[PDB]
Amino acid sequence: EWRVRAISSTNLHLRTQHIYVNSDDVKDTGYTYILPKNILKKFITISDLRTQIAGFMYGVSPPDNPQVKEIRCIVLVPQTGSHQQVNLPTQLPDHELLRDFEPLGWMHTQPNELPQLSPQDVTTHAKLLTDNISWDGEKTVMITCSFTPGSVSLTAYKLTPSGYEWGKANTDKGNNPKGYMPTHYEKVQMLLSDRFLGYFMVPSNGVWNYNFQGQRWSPAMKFDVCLSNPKEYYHEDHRPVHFHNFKA
Amino acid sequence: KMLDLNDLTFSQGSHLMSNKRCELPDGSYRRQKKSYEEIHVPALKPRPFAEGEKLVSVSELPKWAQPAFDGYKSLNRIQSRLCDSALRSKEHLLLCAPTGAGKTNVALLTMLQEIGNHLAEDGSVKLDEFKIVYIAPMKSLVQEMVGSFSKRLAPFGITVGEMTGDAQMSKEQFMATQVIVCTPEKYDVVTRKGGERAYNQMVRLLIIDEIHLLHDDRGPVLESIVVRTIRQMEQNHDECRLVGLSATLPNYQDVATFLRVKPEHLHFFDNSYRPVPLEQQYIGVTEKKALKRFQAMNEVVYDKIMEHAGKSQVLVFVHSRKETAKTAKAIRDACLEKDTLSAFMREGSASTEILRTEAEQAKNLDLKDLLPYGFAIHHAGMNRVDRTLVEDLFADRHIQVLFSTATLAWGVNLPAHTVIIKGTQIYNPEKGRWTELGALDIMQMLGRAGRPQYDDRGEGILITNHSELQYYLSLMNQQLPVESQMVSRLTDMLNAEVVLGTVSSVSEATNWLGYTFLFVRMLKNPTLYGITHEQARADPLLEQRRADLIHTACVLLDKAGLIKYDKRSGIIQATELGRIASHFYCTYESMQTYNKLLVETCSDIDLFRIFSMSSEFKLLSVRDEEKLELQKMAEHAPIPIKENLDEASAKTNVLLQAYISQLKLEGFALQADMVFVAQSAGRLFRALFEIVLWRGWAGLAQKVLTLCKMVTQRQWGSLNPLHQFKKIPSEVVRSIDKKNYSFDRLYDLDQHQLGDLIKMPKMGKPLFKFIRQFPKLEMTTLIQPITRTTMRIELTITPDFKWDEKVHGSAEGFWIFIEDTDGEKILHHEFFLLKQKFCSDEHVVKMIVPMFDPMPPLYYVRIVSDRWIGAETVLPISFRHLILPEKYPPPTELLDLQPLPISAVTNKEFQTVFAESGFKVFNPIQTQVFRTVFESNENVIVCAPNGSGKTAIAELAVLRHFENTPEAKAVYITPMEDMATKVYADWKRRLEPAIGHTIVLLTGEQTMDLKLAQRGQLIISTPERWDNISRRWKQRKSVQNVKLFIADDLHMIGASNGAVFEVVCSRTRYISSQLESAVRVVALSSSLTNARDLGMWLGCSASATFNFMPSTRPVPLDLEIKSFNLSHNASRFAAMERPVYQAICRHAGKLEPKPALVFVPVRRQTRPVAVALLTMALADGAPKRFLRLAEHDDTFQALLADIEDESLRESVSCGVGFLHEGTAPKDVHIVQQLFESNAIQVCVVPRGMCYQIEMSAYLVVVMDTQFYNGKYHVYEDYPIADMLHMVGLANRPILDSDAKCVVMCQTSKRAYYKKFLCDPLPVESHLDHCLHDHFNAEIVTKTIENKQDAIDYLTWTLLYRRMTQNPNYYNLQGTTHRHLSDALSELVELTLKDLENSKCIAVKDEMDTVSLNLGMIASYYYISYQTIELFSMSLKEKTKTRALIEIISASSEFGNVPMRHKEDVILRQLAERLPGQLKNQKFTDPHVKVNLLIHAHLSRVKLTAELNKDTELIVLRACRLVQACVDVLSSNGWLSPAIHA
């Protein structure tokens, strides 16, 4: 029951008329995170409705405010999606400009409601934190957007020390754990910007989603970035296997 | 009134039988049989020869014409009769003759008549003075005619070229071809494209083959061509002979009237003139049951073969490739069933042995099976070798019965005794259904019946339905009238006239429509066109009927958005969509659909959907028998379809994907449909690409552009580009695909690694060659911010591939796109054409992009190949280090001050200077600044728009200075010599008597100019001339005695030569400081953004810094910018011609014509444009509309008689002047006098004379904004300062209350000019590029003795100020004093190191600078250091006179001699005439030009006025170079070379 899912990708631009910051929060203690409307609107249209996709983001402080954080670049990465998890290599994106940023974002797309997070998210962040000694979990936060009907919600989260220790402690499929829990989770302050543009880094070969190319995908999988615009999901270069059976 | 065009359209097309009865020839008889009925028409006997009618021998033709008839003894009967009309008359010719009667040789006779008009005295043909166009109905026939004429025209050196829908001739190929053979549609598209307008004027002969296509639905294409030609001939008076070739059909007298053929040239030859008399048998199947009807046809075919078996060869035509083998075998089996096969082949014949032997070599198995039996097949699916072999075997009479497709009748002249047409129904994919065979096919099939000289008579058997028998009878018995189908295409045809601009009103449309053949037919048969006899009597001219038709079409075209139609005035204006639509032959309904459905968010699925929704496919229906086959295809479709599979739109989409996927189709009709869809896809997707490009949707444009390649390459974009190289086996590339090896990495692999990767070492070297031949381009960018809102990007393109004419052709096209950070909006787009001649040179393209707030982080520069898949390169331009320039200070407000009268100047002598200049009261701008300039001695800068009388401000400073200090010297510097001449001549006339002091203009001669500066109190000079003198200021007290320095048009510092201007201005203040002598600086300029920065650099007070807005002109200026979407300038010129004339009617008005000035890019353009305007005035019936004085005015007649140029004298007699650099000053003065007196309304002036002419006009017209720079081989844009100068001439404050300006430029430049013409101009320094020569001069004078001394001087320059305002322009990384100081230190080191490397100076102790002899020579003679180094490197102990000319010609001082377009050809002709010149010289290099011109001067060869003017400049420059060589050689101690110098 595939082909309509390709067709459904058409309408993703419509959801961009109804983006919302899910602003039910009070913790002004959150190092308030600022995301720009341009890259978000693109990240909507390049998504795929019936699967998660994800990326990493890199930040600048405004020079006049150290604790406000502006998200300034998204790195899309080689990835294989899933309906309600995402597969990301242990390989870390790196570039001069990224190292010249302050490096703090990761975000994923949610098909639907999200009354709570996924443990795959936390374990990803915990694993990510476990690799990224630079990152520090008190600095670094996790973000979700949801394909609500005709709309998008924006919501953002932090992982507590009890969060990290849980992911550090955990190594499981973890469908109904203990410690997958609010002391382990945190909600943090984040904002949307019309005030400036950001930009995308992408893989050196462009092809970020794999899925049917998951045979090509690996958790090890060395890759690099290039500073190019993102190809959309169902772009030909992502989907070429459909053209290669019908060669004759 | 709105009419229904569908009801008036003949849905039957070619089957329209307008004759109600058919009369049979004498002896015709009917035979009714059991299953079929035969109607026999006997073969007509040839008419006897008339008294005196004899065959004209080829020897009777002129000897120069005889080579075209080599191998021919005499002309035929028809050709003999037309010899006078064809060879001796230039009048239009219509030949009505039976098919096969030798029309092709009659066409050749007409060609010779034109060749005779262009035959030179030596017997050569002036191949460049004329062109011949041959219109043929089919591509196969085009190929046949090209081959024939190639043999027949070879003795004349005539080049024959094919120009078809698929075979597009390049313009260079077009130039080399004199006779072009083409299709109607291709010639229409060619004429629609406008590119060949300059070529259409050279077309002197048009031959229209099978013009009776007028009865077919394609007939309107021929009408368009003829009407366009007639309207062009009548309007332009360019004679082109029309030659119509037609069948023997009624209404030929109307066609002659339509073709303007005089009755003397109307030739009708009945069917008795057919070379072989044809007996005709018409078989009308009466069976009502379709199956029994089909069965009866099979019976007839076998029966007639047996009737002719062994008696005569039979050629059986069928409509399908599969039908050839199936029918042939079925009849063969029927021949086997009745044991009649032996009648075809006599047992033991050599032909049986031949056919069996050839069958063994035949690759086609069905042909191989049939060939032993004497049967063969011929169809387009067979290979060319087997087809040619079958053709030969039938020509040799080996094949007795041949089954073939229509292509043989159209592609091979293979006549046969007997022709049998099995069935007359053919599947029409355009109509989606089975339709009757076209008349042309029947006539071509019947044209092959009867072999001349071998058969006494031919027999033609036509098998058809009993209902259709009368139609084919009417066709062959001269009874089928040719009717017009124009109604089906009237909208599209009318659109073409609007796009060409030949029709702009309902009156013009009614006139244009009066030339159509439809109009002749409507007049001749109103009842057929839905016009009642009463209606035709009330409107005998059908004016209302035509206007109602036109009105309906205009509303439809307006409703489609192709035109703007004012229903009241009837005015029609073309839109951009109409142009695109016309250029790609798309219907208005499809464009209207596209206009409705196309959005920026369109996906790939929507693009296919929108394409499938095209109205061209409206007649495609879904067949029940094909849904199941479509079902299999739908499962294999790689792109999802949103529409239901039952919809006709979906079917079209499926077919396209299969073709791109190269899928094999089973249904023949489906396969036919696929080709039809595929053939249309190429032009339609190309049109869509232009639409999205026009709207600027970057991401969509890249997609559509990729799809165009997919259609061309028949492959999906995901496949490796190597698949495009059809010479590489697909299996090899698939082995790479199976390995998932990236294409980019293939460039790094060697041929062995590549061969090993594919496990085929033999293919490694060929692939590597193909790999290194694949188009790849490298990009480097120079980023230059101009303003806080605008940035210049200079893109240098380096080709990194090996050119191959068989792969890349003569030129390859590339699209350069600058996309925003998101890739959504096209910020800039350009078409780059890499030519084979320049495939080794790097191309630098300068472009300017707008900047938005908030600042984007980066932009993307994307270059995309126009044809090659995957040949693209993307370069992100990061703004992380972009330091935006400071916000400019607000402009000076124009105070509403009371106008100062001329009496305000206290000196009565000074009042006369302005009274003589026509001043009564000072303008508001002058009034506000008068007090600061005339009463105060402060430094002042006045930036004001052109036409505000800025020149008077300099005069006031001069008048006041000598009034107060008559003994003190004043210097006025202007960058243009022509302006200096104007100012000097006018001031010498007006100011010198009022001031009583000698005014001098410097000439450039160092010794004489020094005397002039001493003698003259007021010195007018150019910066360059003044720089040479000011160098020795320390010794020249007269320079020290200069107290006033006026720098006019200071904005020219931003031009190429501004570096000298900045230095001259900078030194003036330094000298002013060192002498304790304040030199008052008065700066006059156009409105500037950074006017205060220059004022501060000049020491002007803030109160003395006047910067008025461009809108504050005393005369309001109306600026209209019209954009032309033509990248080819020569084509663009012809597109601008008529809008200019239209602008005169619209802007300069009828009844009260006002003076209009038209600027053209070149002298060569002046005269053609003037003639075109007169031609349009003549076409309007008012040739002298532009003249305002009486023709018999004695002063006008006296002035006319004083004009030396007869063509100018003639043009002026109608009120239109034209000027050029070769016009005598007296004639120029007369034209100026006539224009100022308003005697003549229009004057044509080249861009080079804008500073030379003094005329001011109400309307200024800038015809194009580009000139050809032959050094870079690129057409360069006009400098904005020059543009402002031309616009500045739109100023007549005493005669006109307002001014109009129409700037015609390329669409890509509209935003550029729109910005800088409305807003003030930012001026930046270019001194950094010329520091060496300036640095050397001050070191020679010991002004700079150390590196710090150079730095200190630099602090006085304007550069130092601007470096702080726009660091990134100057590659500075910061605005701090350290970064400024550090960057300055590096620049000094680099400049001085270069001077040290050139041995011009010597640096002692790495700090102190010592001038060397080379520096002294360069500084003394004012020669560039680059030339002095070259002389040091090029001069040798044995250099001789010839080598000296070469070395001197290579000097940088000659690197600025202008190279004009096609000037290399004239230089080539000169080099062939001069002794000892090398034939392999680069005739496009100015150094070669100077070398050739030097030898021509020494040989006293008479040169053109342009080259003479060039020669004068060259010789003057050479004198310094020769003198400079003497000093260089003396420093080296070589006696003999110095003597040679």
Swiss-Prot record, chain A:
MPN domain segment(s): 32-163
Q: Which domain of life is it from?
A: Eukaryota
Record localization: Nucleus
Q: What does this protein do?
A: Functions as a scaffold that mediates the ordered assembly of spliceosomal proteins and snRNAs. Required for the assembly of the U4/U6-U5 tri-snRNP complex. Functions as a scaffold that positions spliceosomal U2, U5 and U6 snRNAs at splice sites on pre-mRNA substrates, so that splicing can occur. Interacts with both the 5' and the 3' splice site.
Q: How does it assemble?
A: Part of the U5 snRNP complex and of the U4/U6-U5 tri-snRNP complex.
Description of its domains: The MPN (JAB/Mov34) domain has structural similarity with deubiquitinating enzymes, but lacks the residues that would bind the catalytic metal ion.
Q: Can you say what this protein is called?
A: Pre-mRNA-splicing factor 8 homolog
Part of the whole protein covered: 2065 to 2312 of 2329
Swiss-Prot record, chain B:
Which residues of the sequence carry a binding annotation for ATP? 97-104, 944-951
**Which keywords does UniProt give here?**
ATP-binding, Helicase, Hydrolase, mRNA processing, mRNA splicing, Nucleotide-binding, Nucleus, Repeat, Spliceosome
Keyword Transcription in the entry? The reply is no
**Where does it mainly reside?**
nucleus
EC number(s) given by UniProt: 3.6.4.13
Outline the extent of the Helicase ATP-binding domain.
Answer: 84-267, 931-1106
Q: Which reaction does it catalyse?
A: ATP + H2O = ADP + phosphate + H(+)
Q: Which GO terms describe its cellular component?
A: spliceosomal complex
* An annotated GO BP: spliceosome conformational change to release U4 (or U4atac) and U1 (or U11)
Q: Where in the cell is it found?
A: Nucleus
**The keyword Phosphoprotein appears for this protein:** no
Motif interval(s): DEAH box: 209-212, 1048-1051
Output one GO MF annotation.
nucleic acid binding
- Helicase C-terminal domain segment(s): 277-494
**Which part of the chain is the SEC63 domain?**
575-878
Recorded superkingdom: Eukaryota
Comment, domains: Contains two helicase domains. The N-terminal helicase domain has catalytic activity by itself, contrary to the C-terminal helicase domain that may have a regulatory role and enhance the activity of the first helicase domain.
Free-text function comment from the UniProt entry: Catalyzes the ATP-dependent unwinding of U4/U6 RNA duplices, an essential step in the assembly of a catalytically active spliceosome. Plays a role in pre-mRNA splicing.
* Family that this chain belongs to: Belongs to the helicase family. SKI2 subfamily.
Question: What protein am I looking at?
Answer: U5 small nuclear ribonucleoprotein 200 kDa helicase
Mind giving the lineage of the organism this protein is from? Eukaryota, Metazoa, Ecdysozoa, Nematoda, Chromadorea
**What's the encoding gene here?**
snrp-200
